[PDB]
Ligand binder design. Structure first.
Ligand SMILES: *[C@@H]1O[C@H](CO)[C@@H](O)[C@H](O)[C@H]1NC(C)=O
Ligand SMILES: *[C@@H]1O[C@H](CO)[C@@H](O)[C@H](O)[C@H]1NC(C)=O
Ligand SMILES: *[C@@H]1O[C@H](CO)[C@@H](O)[C@H](O)[C@H]1NC(C)=O
Lengths: 226, 224, 224
């Protein structure tokens, strides 16, 4: 009998821009006459929940609450609790979610790496990496754009934040993408954009193409008696 | 009343070449004098395990048995069963474990990338990455060999065998490694040793130095 | 009246991954109803011995069989026993074999050399050499590779572990590989891979090709 609470997430906030908070209840029998409500840091009235979920595959009930908040009061570090009154449990279950933060903040650093040439020999596909390092906290967002139109999410894949061995509590992440060498050997910018809270504009991007090196080759033809 | 066992992983094997099967008896009341045992497919007796574990600080007792077999037998697939006997446990319990032979077999193609040029400006650190793509099945093992002696795994980080979006039956992995700039500027071939059970010798290596990949600037042509 | 066996060897382990044991008989009059007993140090027996050989054509006798033991026992030092029974003498003939551990475990050093300049003028064949030096004991198991495809062992020849002239406790070997010049003129990376027991991963490979001898900084030319 445990209740999982999801605070607002950076990825959903940036993608949908319809900030939502939801806590789901687990390990409860398939009963009814159970109401779920949300409370703020002051425990004020909230919005009615919608989109009731179906029971778990192992024959236990499940439900999700819905409400709306704002960044101006979420960022203050205040707590948020959802009230669940299960029929079986006389004591209602309350879960608290907030953001203590107050941690060493720093801007993420973004680097792109062009595909290796030994991959660019069999002439099937190439992979481009976008390494985001030295950022705290977690909940960063990455997506790839080709000439303005974002790529279909089924194409690229992203890692998950993990600690840095040479930095106390500073995270790290990866992101790769595959394009045909047919397209690569012609031209495209393939921008990688990262959305993190610590950035001054919250958004930075860095792009790379096939012609980003070639440091001014030189040809000399000494001629004698010819 | 949770029973589990840890089959010997590929990394567990190659880390010490000391394949061994252990049983996880956790989420039970803290007790003493607990008996764990194994068996073969035909019911033959097993070797005398020892070096049992202790209780968790979370009011839980962990029992670990050290059962050792040979890699030939384990690959042949001798079906084992962790039998745990204790005063509190009412009845014996059985668990079956093996490998589902019949998986797709493919060779992991390894590509090695140098650090970013824009990173090599702060003169602080570099992150060389070892990308292993298009293998089958999972559980690949990667280590970082500078030259000669190996390096501790507390200073480099490895990903998990995440599935490849383009290749479903195939997978991929990422292994990074930090180093100060002065070490990157005096050689340090920094090879990446990766071992998978589909390569003919089960081990392969790749190397990349700072003076690698640089194109040919001059094209002198003496004329006479 | 002498009986000599064949201990398992490092190269025979890597060449087949089908380890066996063979104990041979010689200097005894040919006979029948001769059985060789295969019991371990602890006294228990092993799988039967097959492939009964034919007596040597020099008025002597021989017998060979097959076994299967995982290398954990051999590394631990489990003394295998081949008790041949002969009608020449009533007392059974018992012999055992083992391995020592008092050996310097230095690592081998591998160098490749390209074909001679004058050989690449007659335009018929070329020979490429892989050299090993400075190891102990005698466990080289050197083989060749191209494009990830193993080559037939007929095309390359390996030498014995000849000792060093100066170094007292070190040995060396050699290996050549004949190859067509027109094939050698278009890539064919042609790596050689050694496998000793003092190597941390027990496998090491080096490679050389045509482009191995270029400054990768400039391309001088002579046009007329
Ligand atoms: C390089 O120099 C040679 C000699 O002058 C000349 O024949 C050749 O065309 C030059 N290559 C380029 C790309 O200019
Ligand atoms: C280098 O010069 C040679 C002639 O000396 C020419 O064949 C070749 O195309 C040149 N390389 C490039 C990249 O143009
Ligand atoms: C260098 O010159 C030789 C001789 O003309 C030519 O075969 C070779 O392709 C050249 N290399 C490059 C990179 O142009």
């Amino acid at each position: 009998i445990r209740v999982f609470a999801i605070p607002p997430s950076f990825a959903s906030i940036f993608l949908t821009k319809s900030t939502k908070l939801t806590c789901l209840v687990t390990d409860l029998t398939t009963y009814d006459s159970v109401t779920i409500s949300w409370t703020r840091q002051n425990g004020e009235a909230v919005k009615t929940h919608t989109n009731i979920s179906e029971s778990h595959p192992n024959a236990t009930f499940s439900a999700v609450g819905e409400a709306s908040i704002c960044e101006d009061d979420w960022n203050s570090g205040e707590r948020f609790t959802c009230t669940v009154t299960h029929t079986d449990l006389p004591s209602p279950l309350k879960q608290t979610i907030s953001r203590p933060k107050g941690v060493a903040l720093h801007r993420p650093d973004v680097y792109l790496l062009p595909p290796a040439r030994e991959q660019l020999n069999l002439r099937e596909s190439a992979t481009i990496t976008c390494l985001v390092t030295g950022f705290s906290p977690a909940d960063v967002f990455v997506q790839w754009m080709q000439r303005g139109q974002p790529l279909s999410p089924e194409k690229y894949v992203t890692s998950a934040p993990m600690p840095e061995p040479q930095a106390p509590g500073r995270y790290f992440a990866h992101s790769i993408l595959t394009v045909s060498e047919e397209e690569w050997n012609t031209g495209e910018t393939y921008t990688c954009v990262v959305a993190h809270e610590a950035l001054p504009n919250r958004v930075t991007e860095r792009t790379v193409d096939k012609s980003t090196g070639k440091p001014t080759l030189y040809n000399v033809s000494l001629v004698m008696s010819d």
